């Protein structure tokens, strides 16, 4: 809205990373103090620094807050193993008659190497045919990272309806697994000759097909 | 001290203006500031709008 933030910022583990926050002349440039918060994906945000002059208890001294007139800046020294969150600007807005937050910056560069994926295609069982639906599942497991595109074909034309893709989650041995469903009906399931799922990972494309008859 | 008949040019006539107008525009622009007073609700005295 009234506060704009960059989408992402790049840095190195050992140099200085500085973020710039720009607003208006009635919320931050009027004279109001600014507050910075960290939005960890899964935990409630906490207070980092208020007023850019005092240090709250439990907060390290590596975080520095300054207000260069209409713009506020935050600087850090060294990238540790907990900076994988979002930084926001909080200031009182007279026009909005309340507190308004910023956009949010993501702090990550690269932590995902490559691996070799493996897929499995399982046709629906006999009890699924009488439910007036056909859920075609093509599971993908043991791959890294979790960025796989899913394409469905019926050996004559690609299927662009009912295609879904779930987000992958970390396995026990630091890998990723995913599944893809396809909503169909048993009326046309038997008419088609075969069904398959096609995926591509870093140029490696594998294909598995099943025959209902 | 003796002037004969004829035409004679003595000085020059200059019409000095008495008033000056220097107004360049007809009106100047404005900025949105009436919303400070024309508002649905106001703030309090411990935390007022700046
Ligand atoms: C506020 O609203 C009134 C009526 O809508 C209008 O006459 C006036 O010019 C506006 N601005 C101020 C500063 O009062």
């Amino acid at each position: 809205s009234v506060l704009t933030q960059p989408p992402s910022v790049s840095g190195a583990p050992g140099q200085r990373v500085t973020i710039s926050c720009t607003g208006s002349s009635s919320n931050i440039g009027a004279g109001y103090d600014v507050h910075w918060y960290q939005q960890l994906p899964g935990t409630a945000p906490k207070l980092l620094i208020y007023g850019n002059s005092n240090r709250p208890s439990g907060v390290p001294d590596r975080f520095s807050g300054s207000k260069s007139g209409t713009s506020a800046s935050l600087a850090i020294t060294g990238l540790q193993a907990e900076d994988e969150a979002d930084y926001y600007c909080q200031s009182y807005d007279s026009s909005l008659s309340g507190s308004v937050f910023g956009g949010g910056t993501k702090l990550t560069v690269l932590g995902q190497p490559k691996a070799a994926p493996s897929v499995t295609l399982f046709p629906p069982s006999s009890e699924e045919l009488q439910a007036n639906k056909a859920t075609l599942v093509c599971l993908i497991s043991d791959f890294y990272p979790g960025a796989v595109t899913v394409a469905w074909k019926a050996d004559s034309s690609p299927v662009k309806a009912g295609v879904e893709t779930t987000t992958p989650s970390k396995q026990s041995n630091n890998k990723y697994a995913a599944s893809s469903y396809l909503s169909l009906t048993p009326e046309q399931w038997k008419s088609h000759r075969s069904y398959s799922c096609q995926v591509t990972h870093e140029g490696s494309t594998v294909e598995k097909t099943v025959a209902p008859t | 001290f003796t002037v004969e008949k004829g035409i004679y040019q003595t000085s020059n006539f200059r019409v000095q203006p008495t008033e000056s107008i220097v107004r360049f525009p007809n009106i100047t622009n404005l900025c949105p500031f009436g919303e400070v007073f024309n508002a649905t609700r106001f703030a309090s005295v411990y935390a007022w709008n700046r």
Side-chain angles (χ1 to χ4, degrees), chain A residues 1-113 115-186 188-213, chain B:
Chain A
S1 158
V2 80
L3 300 171
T4 75
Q5 282 190 223
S8 89
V9 279
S10 159
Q15 63 114 21
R16 181 202 180 193
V17 172
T18 311
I19 195 56
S20 321
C21 200
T22 298
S24 89
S25 160
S26 197
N27 46 1
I28 171 171
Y32 294 86
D33 270 296
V34 287
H35 309 308
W36 299 83
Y37 301 94
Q38 198 173 4
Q39 269 71 27
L40 204 57
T43 83
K46 304 299 184 179
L47 174 67
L48 263 72
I49 172 164
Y50 63 100
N52 287 15
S53 49
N54 315 333
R55 288 251 59 95
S57 46
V59 197
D61 206 76
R62 301 308 173 184
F63 274 73
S64 46
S66 87
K67 292 180 297 178
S68 86
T70 326
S71 197
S73 85
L74 186 136
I76 56 178
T77 298
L79 290 182
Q80 54 263 3
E82 71 102 24
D83 310 326
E84 37 261 34
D86 311 288
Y87 297 95
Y88 275 72
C89 310
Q90 195 256 300
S91 159
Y92 196 84
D93 194 13
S94 83
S95 45
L96 211 54
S97 163
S99 315
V100 50
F101 283 83
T105 74
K106 210 167 191 62
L107 191 55
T108 180
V109 202
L110 209 159
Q112 297 297 277
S118 199
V119 305
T120 40
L121 174 55
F122 284 142
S125 307
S126 194
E127 80 275 346
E128 210 264 335
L129 304 181
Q130 304 97 336
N132 204 64
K133 53 179 177 179
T135 77
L136 258 181
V137 55
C138 205
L139 297 96
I140 313 164
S141 278
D142 315 277
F143 58 94
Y144 208 100
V148 195
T149 183
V150 195
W152 296 77
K153 284 116 188 164
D155 317 280
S156 159
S157 197
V159 181
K160 307 309 287 174
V163 172
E164 67 94 3
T165 303
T166 86
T167 182
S169 312
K170 189 169 297 180
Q171 297 187 206
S172 44
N173 59 313
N174 310 87
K175 314 322 310 183
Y176 282 94
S179 287
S180 278
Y181 273 61
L182 166 67
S183 86
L184 281 185
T185 166
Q188 43 83 38
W189 160 254
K190 282 91 174 162
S191 55
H192 296 104
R193 270 72 52 203
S194 281
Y195 272 91
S196 159
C197 80
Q198 284 198 346
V199 295
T200 298
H201 200 87
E202 71 203 72
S204 81
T205 295
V206 84
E207 179 188 7
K208 188 180 295 297
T209 326
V210 290
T213 78
Chain B
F1 277 61
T2 300
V3 183
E4 285 88 6
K5 48 163 57 181
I7 210 55
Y8 296 107
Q9 186 150 329
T10 60
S11 46
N12 294 272
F13 183 47
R14 192 88 42 79
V15 186
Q16 293 283 357
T18 38
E19 61 267 24
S20 277
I21 38 179
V22 75
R23 47 130 199 80
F24 304 110
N26 95 317
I27 202 146
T28 197
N29 70 276
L30 254 291
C31 52
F33 82 110
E35 54 97 20
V36 180
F37 327 119
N38 273 314
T40 73
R41 79 178 197 277
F42 276 5
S44 199
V45 294
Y46 73 98
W48 36 265
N49 314 120
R50 179 179 287 181

